[PDB]
Symmetry: C4
Subunit: 385 residues, 4 copies
């Protein structure tokens, strides 16, 4: 089976809860990795949670300093969806402080970036065997999606960035076939900033919705065909998607400068000229989560929208979010099912612990009845250590 990736997104009305791992609550007692940057990806047979460990467990002195993003100890590992990530249930994937993974219908591609900030190297594996490497081309923190790559017709596609986090950087699309890079192109995107892209397949092409850490509080997007012919823009809705951001107002199809510096990984799904936006509830901190349906928000700049569905209350911590899909080959449906996950970050810098970790929740789009609620992390901090 190679996944064809030729179907369009399923029609949906809302989001049904799919998983909740309670990883941090469980890790108070059990042997659970300190992690961050979790994401879900599926094959034609099953779904897995990928994550970047800190090479350490919760409620242990080695969790000290784990707010830090990059180290030689961080590893990409995976476990079944909805299970707490433990050394006893997790598969080792790669040594990595930035990662992506996806399944083409025949095997798992994993991409794990490690090494020094001035010369990092991405190691590509297919079926767990090294198949390629990509070295930093700007010598400034080579980095990738922290969510699943997108597979169409036997090729998989990702985005990598190298360069400043606070100014113009360099962005490339990669086409990968059985773990080997077969094509790449650099985005000609002066005045754009792309990080941590959430990319999905749709009708034989790929759409990515990303993070502008330089000067945009709306999200940049890039779409492309299998030949890497691409288009770029920003989501136009005045329902701004990044964190931090301004209050909702008049949007732009270029970067919205107000509160544009810094950011958070996120995602959106385009339906025609409309968009499903996942975002924090706070404009200033990584708190709460909600899904908003804006029926003209892909291309129009008003702040009007039609549906809001609560996911995490504003009084609870949230974190990264990302898209994942379930292909027809897995579901038996005739359309591409859209899903998403949310990372619930606990500890530093917002809480007075020695450590930082995240738990996860996930949802899938359905055309049937759903409900808003809050499904927060629920851990009681600090722990014994």
């Amino acid at each position: 089976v190679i996944l064809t990736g030729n179907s369009s997104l399923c029609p949906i009305s809302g989001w049904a809860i799919y998983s909740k791992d309670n990883g941090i609550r469980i890790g108070s007692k059990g042997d659970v990795f300190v992690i961050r940057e979790p994401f879900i990806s599926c094959s034609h047979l099953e779904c897995r949670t990928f994550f970047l460990t800190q090479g350490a467990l919760l409620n242990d002195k080695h969790s000290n300093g784990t707010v830090k993003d990059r180290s030689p100890y961080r590893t990409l590992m995976s476990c079944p969806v909805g299970e707490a990530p433990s050394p006893y249930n997790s598969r080792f994937e790669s040594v990595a402080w930035s990662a992506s993974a996806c399944h083409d219908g025949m095997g798992w591609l994993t991409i794990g970036i490690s090494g020094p900030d001035n010369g990092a190297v991405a190691v590509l594996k297919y079926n767990g065997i090294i198949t390629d490497t990509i070295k930093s081309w700007r010598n400034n923190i080579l980095r990738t999606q922290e969510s699943e790559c997108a597979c169409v017709n036997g090729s998989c596609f990702t985005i990598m960035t190298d360069g400043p986090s606070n100014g113009q950087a360099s962005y490339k699309i990669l086409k990968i076939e059985k773990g080997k890079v077969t094509k790449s192109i650099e985005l000609n995107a002066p005045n754009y900033h792309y990080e941590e892209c959430s990319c999905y397949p749709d009708t034989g092409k790929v759409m990515c919705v990303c993070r502008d850490n330089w000067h945009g509080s709306n999200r940049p997007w890039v779409s492309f065909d299998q030949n890497l012919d691409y288009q770029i823009g920003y989501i136009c809705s005045g329902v701004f998607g990044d964190n931090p951001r301004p209050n909702d107002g008049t949007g732009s199809c270029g970067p919205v400068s107000s509160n544009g510096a810094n950011g958070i990984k996120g995602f959106s799904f385009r339906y025609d000229n409309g968009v499903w936006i996942g975002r924090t509830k706070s404009t200033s901190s990584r708190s709460g989560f909600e899904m908003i349906w804006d029926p003209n928000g892909w291309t129009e700049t008003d702040s009007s929208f039609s549906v809001r569905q609560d996911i995490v209350a504003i009084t609870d911590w949230s974190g990264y979010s990302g898209s994942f899909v379930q292909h027809p080959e897995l579901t038996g449906l005739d359309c591409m099912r859209p899903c998403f996950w949310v990372e619930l970050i606990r500890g530093q810098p917002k809480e007075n612990t020695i450590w930082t970790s995240g738990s996860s929740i996930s949802f899938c789009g359905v055309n049937s009845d759903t409900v808003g609620w809050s499904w927060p992390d629920g851990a009681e901090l600090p722990f014994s250590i």
Copy 2:
């Protein structure tokens, strides 16, 4: 293989012990979930224990407050029969504070209800993929079996309730095929109350024995064919099945009002006009367990019975109980084998720990020699936390 469900219940003389997980005893030291509402269900290949976690482990501060029935942290998970439920041996099924599950011979159906009390949503999954949702229709704690659904001829069947726990509510039978609701019907049952049904297949139809929390100390039942043509009644025996209940006396084929409010999940198996009743030994607390064979107790109101088999002594805590079956496709027999499980609740509200959890035992009906004994939880409370 779809399970035919066309066989009748095996002839039996008593109950042989099948499993004991010692979960709470083990959780004094190991990494074991805080749970409640466990149940067993089987495929044509194996048997599994399902349970509602509290998103926390025993002997940890996150076990605090786990007497509480519903939260966003509760998840439906499963592990092999007889094993302690741990994050290291348990599969994630759904986010849920009320659940059911069953296997049609081809795949697992799980039903997990989460969300707010005034608008809960049941998420149905088949082979782990969301296939349907059902929203609360009375906006008052949508809830289901907390035991296995029943499968006959490629369709599976369950009961859901919505409305008051202390007055007339609404009860629906659902027919589900590959995880999609294909038919439903509301019971016309004024003056009845149905919760937490224990439902089994028998001769191409389904029988459910349930809990009347409003005003019955005997148990209500509902039977139906594959078209959802149904019959309703209460078990007539004066050997009253609920907890609490009066002393044994003259029964009724409608609800016995004496000590009828409140209740406990339980089960019974009909054989002709007779009945095997599983019940607590105490009339006032969730203590002890016994099986009673009353050869005319399905339809006649006397308090006489023929056989009593001890399962848990009255000096030890019991809890919920439920039916499960082993189909011919699993056992190789020419009849449907009846079995049952018992939840052994420890902690709150009867013990003044910070937590509540349960362990489990199970038995299967045999036409061979058996013995009464007591197989209680055996944990020594409190733990370290």
Copy 3:
């Protein structure tokens, strides 16, 4: 595949070490069951360690009182050979304070006895499904091998005892086919005492070597064909096999009364008129272990022997031992391979802990070079609890 059981024992010169689980050393820190009565049994594909848990882990207060033999919490479980028995790696088999198990080439038979001392019941399972029960016929601690049953030509065979531990009791051979008892016979053995038989297949028949707890310091044996036509005797060698026992001297083909009361489970392998005897090194305590080849010891009463191979030094604790075989279907050999295990008992009554448990070692017979040594338990008692 049904195992034919038609081959004869392989020629051997000594014993090569096969496994060591270090269970108690590991259980000082890790989550390891308190156990006793471990044994190994194999299929045509793999070997497993079976054991009777105490429903509790080491280094925990529930290990208190575990010198006690029988309780409702004890369960028969299994794990891979050489692994520490944990809730995270062990399969649940049956509720049991006495047990046997074996594989016929198509599936696992397990026999688990639980219930009260005056009316215990053995539950037989095949492929994990209950297939028969056997109730106590003397109402005095129905009990079985605590080692593997023997399979020949699609039937499996075991021995059960009911009656006094210090006087004449009742002994039956059982023939079991796909978990159903198809034949049984009571041994006509006045003045014999049979407990805890170690039984192996050989040339289409079965040989069992057992424990006389009444009045023999040599071991009783019983051999039989597939029709349960049997012969009985005691091992004649003056190299006495039980513990306690006298110093080596003149043996008997009936029970040797000197130091005959009490005993230990053990085994021996007959080769022609010779015997391989496994025994403790101490005559008075369960200490040390050795294998002795006595080339005429099956039928002759002298105390001469030709080979001794050290297994555990006399300064270290030993415990039960038992035979297991590896059939041609597993090994590819043209003969039946003899193997044995030893239980290394720690704690009560010899050591001042609240608990009793055992670890295990095992060996297989080879016709190649071997060496004597000591492979003791190695745990440092007491633990924190």
Copy 4:
């Protein structure tokens, strides 16, 4: 599938990071074996880490004294590559204080040496069944590779040593088919010393690079064909490979006596007359690790080399290292892929803890971009115990 072993080593430019288990960091809180002497070996389907436990876990009193090399508690076990070695994820292989293992395309061979120093016995298993034994022929610590054996065309090959660690000893090549020794030959190697060989297949033959503990600070090598026709020598490069060693200088094709006593297990890969040398960074302690490409270093004695790639900084502890290969049957390539692992030793004798253990990293050779860095153990000693 038998692995042909007929391909030559892949062309490479450097080493891409393959795994990092963080075992000791994880064992600060989790249940992780005390180990040493880890090594990786692969089949046509997967890669596994093998290791010698001390029959004890980290952060527990039974870790006391584990600097000691040989005991009856040490066992050869295996787990998936990159996972912490735990009793909950590790398969038991053999009882062993010296070992090797490898897969011939059809099944796993394991070799585990246990017993006394004056008469140790190697137990050979194929698919987990004992297939042969080899006894000590010099009665002085029979010992083997502590890394994978090499398989070519259905036979597997290893080196064993018996005799002094500080003078002339005896060295044998063994040929093994389905776990049975089918041929052996003693090396005629007066004035050489061979221990702990790292052996790989290349073009239908085997090359081993070993440790001279007697009087060489360069490494000895032995190559042979399937008939065990052999050649011997020492690596000629003045880039000395052992630890301890003198500063780089003029090499020798025989043993370099300067600082020749003592040593460390290591490896090298021959390409034409050149060599890839893995070595510690320190000349005096087991600190740091680097890969050096010396394009004439197999046969020429100068100290010039072309490429140095950092692996572990000199400020951090390293340890043993060894070769492993990935065959074409696993990778789908047309050449034999060279890889290596490094053991990162913590505790005694360099740190004053009660215990000694190791974690591991591994790399594979690629003809694509790579980078030098440091991926050290990272644990913060001491632990709680």
